C-alpha cells in the first residue's frame, strides 16, 4: 500500500533508508584510525636532501637480476637417456 516508484535504490525517488548508531560507530572508529595514521606519517627520519641515492647500488642490482632472469631462457638440453629410456616399454620377463 506504500510503493517506491521505479527501482528501489536508483532514481530520483528512492527508499528513504536512515543512518544508524552502528554506522556512526563504524565511521568514527575508521576516522580515529586515520588520524593516528597521519600523526605517524608526519615526521620523516631522513630529510629529502639526506635520502638522495641512498640505495642506488641495490636498485641497480635488482634490475640486473631481473635482466639475467630473462637472459637465461633457452630451449632445455635434450639427453640420451630419454629417447633410449622410451625403449623400456617392451621389457620382457622370461
Amino acid at each position: 500500500r506504500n510503493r517506491i516508484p521505479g527501482r528501489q535504490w536508483i532514481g530520483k525517488h528512492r527508499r528513504p533508508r536512515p543512518v544508524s548508531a552502528q554506522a556512526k560507530q563504524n565511521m568514527i572508529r575508521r576516522l580515529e584510525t586515520e588520524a593516528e595514521n597521519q600523526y605517524w606519517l608526519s615526521r620523516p627520519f631522513l630529510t629529502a636532501e639526506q635520502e638522495r641515492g641512498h640505495a642506488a647500488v641495490r636498485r641497480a642490482a635488482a634490475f640486473q637480476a631481473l635482466k639475467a632472469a630473462q637472459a637465461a631462457r633457452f630451449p632445455a638440453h635434450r639427453r640420451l637417456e630419454e629417447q633410449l629410456g622410451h625403449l623400456l616399454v617392451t621389457r620382457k620377463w622370461s
Binding site: 637472459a71 637465461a72 631462457r73 633457452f74 630451449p75 632445455a76 638440453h77 635434450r78 639427453r79 640420451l80 629417447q83
Partner: protein, 55 residues
C-alpha cells in the same frame, strides 16, 4: 656433426667464449642429434677456434 662427449665440447666452448662476453653464454646441448646451440652470432670466432684445435 659432433661425435663424442658433447659436454666435453660445451665446457671448452663456454670457457672460451666467456671472457669475450663477460658472462657465461647460454647453450642448448643435444645428445641425440649430436648438436650444440649457442645464443648470438659467434660464427666467425668459432671457425677460428675449431681450426686451431684442428677439427
Amino acid at each position: 656433426k659432433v661425435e663424442g662427449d658433447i659436454w666435453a665440447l660445451q665446457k671448452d666452448v663456454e670457457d672460451f667464449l666467456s671472457p669475450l662476453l663477460g658472462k657465461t653464454p647460454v647453450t642448448q646441448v643435444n645428445e641425440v642429434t649430436g648438436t650444440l646451440r649457442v645464443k648470438g652470432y659467434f660464427d666467425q670466432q668459432l671457425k677460428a677456434w675449431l681450426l686451431e684445435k684442428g677439427f
